[PDB]
Design a protein around this nucleic acid. Structure first.
Lengths: 82, 107, 94, 98, 94, 81, 108, 93
DNA sequence: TCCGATCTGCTTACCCAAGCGGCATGACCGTGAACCACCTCACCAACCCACGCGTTACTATGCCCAGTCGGCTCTATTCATCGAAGGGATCATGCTTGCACCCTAACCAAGATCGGAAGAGCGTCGTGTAACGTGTGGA
DNA sequence: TCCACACGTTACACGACGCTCTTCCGATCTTGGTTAGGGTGCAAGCATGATCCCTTCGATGAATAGAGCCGACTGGGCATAGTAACGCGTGGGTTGGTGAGGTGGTTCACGGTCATGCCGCTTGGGTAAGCAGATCGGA
């Protein structure tokens, strides 16, 4: 299973919901692609750190604690998963 | 031997033996004194009591007798000291706070 | 089949001391455990750095008190310092 | 003669609704597939714990919500209520991410 | 007589090319010693400590002014205003 | 020492902004900037003093200030190591 | 010590000290034990980073007709390199000045 | 006291790269501060990595993974290559 | 007459509140047991405390000129208002696909067991590094 | 022209060498558990299209206040000397934290099991937005 072009799965309504939770009243139509790119960059960084943490342990499954450690490295601690 | 009362009861507190063991096998110092576990356990217990009291107050204001992540987020972000302490902390299933900029409100 | 120690017994005794008629969900239990572990790590690291900067090989109550003063802001630091001093005094009184 | 709400009202209602709630806003399966595709450039045939993908989704949504808050503030600073890519770029520039 | 802005660019170029301190040594030293009077009375300061404080403060102020200018340009202006400083400090994390 | 905050004069703020790439300056940003500056100092110095009070010292050494700055995520290179 | 003392820094072909790094890792309280190849790796990485920064600083100093690296040249070298700037992003270099960047909007 | 610093090693590296370029005392102090900061960063990350896997020894693997985590992009790749070369030259007598 | 406000008076979606399943979800008992915190004696090394001494931080004085302070001009910049148009909001339809849920087979994480390599720790020592002194050239 | 740097020289202390001893790491095996993939149903949230409003951007003009210039003034920095507050080192004592061996108390885990807190669903009402209609200030 090779996956391709799944960044478009972060649909326009999902970005609208995220903005509404952020307290946004109006949304420019060209901000969805920018938000998708920002999300892709953030996910790339966090997932790369998580994969590094996983492969240091000679593992093949990315656990939740690897993601927690990666997020702690980024400076954004996450509470709820360990 | 003796009756062997725990240190957590001698100090009147949270575990003191477990905190001491973590301080030892956490590679923080070559030696760990006998006042470090008691002080650290007391500080942790105070912080936990404060955050739990605020979360319970939020739950009571929400008419629910069970603290959930949303209540913890509300308690943490509604205080100033806790929001300064845990500003850079994400809480799973905690949501955000209902604030809206005054400009967006209808005229 | 492995012991998983956590601060779940102790943040429920504290909860029953503060609010004797209020429970807590499993997700909130995990969040409380994560918070306690993070604060423990922060205070312990600050105390370790304080002891290393002074060329010391012990962590006494002074290092923990200074770490609490450094991290905890405002009235939280004062109240935590008072609580820790009171607990240490009770411990060395018996 | 249908009843049509004036623009900006349903937006405010949705703001209140999505700030009063706590659930995840991105669909779970598309985000999981996106995460798995992203993790393909770092290691082949990787496996993901369900809790790992859930934590990734929680962190991503929290980061995006904070970024949208900063973007809304930067847009209101420019005497506008419509948030543009300029506001996102400025928010990420001031925060120190670009 | 140069038009308003011609000498401003010259000053910007001169103060970006150079690397010396911009706040005077003595007023900043007195400010630091006055601020440190609410934390510990009869407190002495090393010369290198005051110098380091001045470098840190001026670097922070220069970074803040860069962010403030970015915010002011974002709002279709060249004159930076206190609202720009407040927005920069809010977005940064202060 | 009384009211030494006004020692950060208007030309000093202008020079700091010029180094920051600022072309024009509003008249009300001086009395604001000073306050911000004081706040910054009111943090860093405080931590420095704490680092002194733990060491049973009186003089605030440069390393206390360096550690205080490192605490807030602003590392300073050149002073004391 | 019957045999001649061959420093471990010469064995690895480095200039930075591996013995000093090993002692710092041991007495710095990072772990109960440290491997033999950890000081060597850390010294090699430190030497590479120092060589990179010094090469860029020397290039900057030569660009300014100077034959002596000063903090200003170090700041110029750090800020002009994307990787180094991202690495040393939070640090401030004493007497390093500021990169001469003026926004194009303010220019006439 | 006998205070230790990386001044002599930084000077050796500078003479290796730029044969006829000096370095100021303040610049050398800044170089020493940078070296100490990076040393402490990599050592702390290696310690955290070793503790996460319930290990007890910081071997070369922990240092390499900490280098991969800290240094960005091509810096990490080149530092990893240089460290691997040095460690594989050290174990061969 | 007349025009834009200004009530005012229905409609009308929307959300919050209350009550009845009904359910899954903490609290707790009940073992049960594996863990590890507590008690006690040796001990030795990190720490404490008094004393010495030399940095070095603070103080007072003199001055002088480059930096600062205040005013005057005026012009570039900022702010208020208008028009508008098009970019975005809102809503109705159709349907794609994410969500609910069960099987499987592969695949991997965790635990046990040699057993061999590897790191701490002991004692010696002899180079490397820092500490100082002094010429000398890069800014 | 010069004051910060790059060549000595010493001397001492710490990294290297050798050996012991204990303790992790790699190879190997075994076993449960836990994802990836596949399958079906469906309904609801997404995609698309229509309609239309009101936000933002460009133009224009007032206004305003900050930049530039200039005269007065005055305190920051440099030079000098003086004095003691205190930081660092040193030596002797000391006390308290580690280590090892038992030993039961704490705590985690698995299974109900049981109130039971909360959610889904339905019903009902408070509510504020929205558009048509009547009226009212002056012109």
């Amino acid at each position: 299973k090779v996956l391709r072009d799944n960044i478009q799965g972060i649909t326009k309504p999902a970005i609208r919901r995220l903005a509404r939770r952020g307290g946004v009243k109006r949304i420019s139509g060209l901000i969805y692609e920018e938000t998708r790119g920002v999300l892709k960059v953030f996910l790339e960084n966090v997932i790369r750190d998580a994969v590094t943490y996983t492969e240091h342990a000679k593992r093949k499954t990315v656990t939740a604690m690897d993601v927690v450690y990666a997020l702690k490295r980024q400076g954004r601690t996450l509470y709820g998963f360990g | 031997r003796a009756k062997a009362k725990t240190r957590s009861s001698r100090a009147g507190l949270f575990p003191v033996g477990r905190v001491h063991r973590l301080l030892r096998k956490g590679n923080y110092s070559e030696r760990v004194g006998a006042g470090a576990p008691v002080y650290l356990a007391a500080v942790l217990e105070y912080l936990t009591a404060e955050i739990l009291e605020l979360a319970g107050n939020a739950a009571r204001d929400n008419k629910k007798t069970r603290i959930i992540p949303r209540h913890l987020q509300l308690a943490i972000r509604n205080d100033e000291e806790l929001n300064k302490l845990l500003g850079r902390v994400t809480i799973a299933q905690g949501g955000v706070l209902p604030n809206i900029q005054a400009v967006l409100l209808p005229k | 089949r492995s012991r998983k120690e956590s601060y779940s017994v102790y943040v429920y005794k504290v909860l029953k001391q503060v609010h004797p008629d209020t429970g807590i969900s499993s997700k909130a239990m995990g969040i409380m455990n994560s918070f306690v572990n993070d604060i423990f790590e922060r205070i312990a690291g600050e105390a370790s750095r304080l002891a290393h900067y002074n060329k010391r090989s012990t962590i006494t109550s002074r290092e923990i008190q200074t770490a609490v003063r450094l991290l905890l802001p405002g009235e939280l630091a004062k109240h935590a310092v008072s609580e820790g001093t009171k607990a240490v005094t009770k411990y060395t009184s018996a | 003669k249908p009843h049509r709400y004036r623009p900006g009202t349903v937006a405010l209602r949705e703001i209140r609704r999505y700030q009063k709630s706590t659930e995840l806003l991105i669909r779970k399966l598309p985000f999981q597939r996106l995460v798995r595709e992203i993790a393909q450039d770092f290691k082949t045939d990787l496996r993901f714990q369900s809790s790992a993908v859930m934590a990734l989704q929680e962190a991503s949504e929290a980061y995006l919500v904070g970024l949208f808050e900063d973007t809304n503030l930067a847009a209101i600073h420019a005497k506008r209520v419509t948030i543009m890519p300029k506001d996102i770029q400025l928010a990420r520039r001031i925060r120190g991410e670009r």
